[PDB]
Structure 1
Amino acid sequence: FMVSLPRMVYPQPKVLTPCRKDVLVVTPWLAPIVWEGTFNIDILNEQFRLQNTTIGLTVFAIKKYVAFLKLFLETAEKHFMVGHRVHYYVFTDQPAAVPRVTLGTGRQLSVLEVRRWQDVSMRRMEMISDFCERRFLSEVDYLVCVDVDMEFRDHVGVEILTPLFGTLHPSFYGSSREAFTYERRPQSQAYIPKDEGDFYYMGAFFGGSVQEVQRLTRACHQAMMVDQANGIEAVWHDESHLNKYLLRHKPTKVLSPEYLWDQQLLGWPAVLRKLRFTAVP
């Protein structure tokens, strides 16, 4: 049950003026595409706080990648879901190398020990699904799954929360589908033909409700097992599988490249009013 919002004073939305005229802000299946200017964060914060929303954030830090945790976590403290309950899940082979980062109230961190970089990247699907299945259901409302070699530079908040979301890969948001680096071999479960595809989503940032995230990760894990048995490895590993899944199961929001940017590689185009979550060289 959802109680009433309180009285709020904010600018009237005007029907005959778009928030953004330079970009697509809704998909053909009526999922919002989240850009700066499309949302009033005060309204969204109220809606989600009134539900006492808890957001889980998963991150893998294996071998040398433990080096990225300090900046990742400190910047998440400044920019990720501030004001809401947050549970970080750090999956690592070196629990003792996890930095002691100071957390704000209502925020906690669990270190989960786990066991080729391609396999490290791909295997995230198995651990998120069939090993941590029960824990997440009991502890959080939404799961957000991200790469660790990143930093937050601006607000990433409840505007992203929805049953299932993907993020536009920063190298492909302006590309034709034939240029998308989908798996193109019919022998792979990740196969997408040249005449299919909505977007190219990045493997580095997806999420949704616990239920939908566990469905996605279970499906990708199973698909990857089939490929392994058939002696084939998708061109972009779990990102390829993620793309196949989100083609056949449309996300309920799509995040713009504000949410996964690489300034060194791609600069700062006019279309991006904010760079929120960015690659660390």
Structure 2
Amino acid sequence: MVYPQPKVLTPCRKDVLVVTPWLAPIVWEGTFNIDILNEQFRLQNTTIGLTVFAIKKYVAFLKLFLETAEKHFMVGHRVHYYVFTDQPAAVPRVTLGTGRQLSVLEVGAYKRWQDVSMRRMEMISCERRFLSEVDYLVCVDVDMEFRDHVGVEILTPLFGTLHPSFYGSSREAFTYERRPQSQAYIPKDEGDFYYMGAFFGGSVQEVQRLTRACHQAMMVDQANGIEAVWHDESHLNKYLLRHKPTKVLSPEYLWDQQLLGWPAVLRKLRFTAVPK
């Protein structure tokens, strides 16, 4: 297998940070040779599970989400979609590529948007089925579309994704939970990045750990009369501060061209918000 030689005195990207201070790759276009990664992951017959909640009106987002995932998400690898919905008959029948399957998991609807978004951690953690069926789990919002490659480069024991509104910001600007009353509490002088709750994942074991931890933390907050400021994302950020991810995705992986344009530092816009 023949490819460009990496040269150690020629960096790929000089414009962005491509490794965290705990030596986790930060995933940008030009940092990876996908042909190498694809080979490595195919040699293990990797199966990737993709979880998405479509509760209430959000079933409307599934057709574009799944169609575009078929075009861009882990193409060539085994993929198992898990669609959590209160409306199984509303899941569109989208034609899938070979090695790809979809399961519909019927769940209850909470009235409040905070609990729908928040009880995802609980819903994800359903535990023995993921362990037997997939190697990795990827957990994303449904109001999104894939516009470019999202592949095995993201796979690692634990990853989070840089929030597109805060990647160029200083930590005191991060909208972490700042009340010491909350399990999600992070002091003003702490913090690596501000991760978005819309795209995280890892090995099935590490995702079950994270989601269990976040759920346990939110129940503690509830039994104490406090709701973290950005809810699941607050707790996600506290978890990833204390258990550092082994890869970080750049904002190529979570973007909104309408709000933020297409800056030169983003060579690809891979997974983006749908207008709502």
Q: Residues of 2 paired with 1:31 and 1:118: CA distance?
A: 31
Stretches of structure 2 lacking an aligned partner (at least 5 in a row): none
Report what 2:118 is aligned to. 122
What is the Cα deviation at residue 195 of structure 1? 0.3
What is the Cα deviation at residue 148 of structure 1? 0.1
Q: Secondary structure at the match of 2:201?
A: strand
What is the Cα deviation at residue 171 of structure 1? 0.2
Q: Residues of 1 paired with 2:182 and 2:124: CA distance?
A: 22
What is the Cα deviation at residue 162 of structure 1? 0.1
Q: Secondary structure at the match of 1:57?
A: strand
Provide runs of 4+ in structure 1 moved above 6 Å: none
Q: For residues 116-195 of structure 1, what are the structure 2 equivalents within 5 Å?
A: 116-129=112-125, 132-195=126-189
What is the Cα deviation at residue 270 of structure 1? 0.6
Report what 1:218 is aligned to. 212
Q: For residues 39-54 of structure 1, what are the structure 2 equivalents within 5 Å?
A: 39-54=32-47
User: Deviation string for 1:230-256 (max 9, x for gaps)?
Assistant: 000000000000000000000000000
Q: Secondary structure at the match of 2:145?
A: strand
What is the Cα deviation at residue 150 of structure 1? 0.1
Question: Structure 1-normalised TM-score?
Answer: 0.96
What is the Cα deviation at residue 268 of structure 1? 0.5
What is the Cα deviation at residue 37 of structure 1? 0.1
Report what 2:271 is aligned to. 277
Report what 1:3 is aligned to. none
Q: Residues of 2 paired with 1:180 and 1:262: CA distance?
A: 19
Stretches of structure 1 lacking an aligned partner (at least 5 in a row): 1-7
What is the Cα deviation at residue 63 of structure 1? 0.2
Q: Secondary structure at the match of 1:87?
A: strand
Q: Which of 98, 104, 107 is residue 91 of structure 2 equivalent to?
A: 98
Q: Residues of 2 paired with 1:9 and 1:138: CA distance?
A: 36
Q: Secondary structure at the match of 1:108?
A: strand
User: Deviation string for 1:204-247 (max 9, x for gaps)?
Assistant: 00000000000000000000000000000000000000000000
User: Deviation string for 1:25-72 (max 9, x for gaps)?
Assistant: 000000000000000000000000000000000000000000000000
RMSD of Structure 2 on Structure 1 (CA): 0.6
What is the Cα deviation at residue 125 of structure 1? 0.2
Q: Secondary structure at the match of 2:235?
A: helix
What is the Cα deviation at residue 11 of structure 1? 0.5
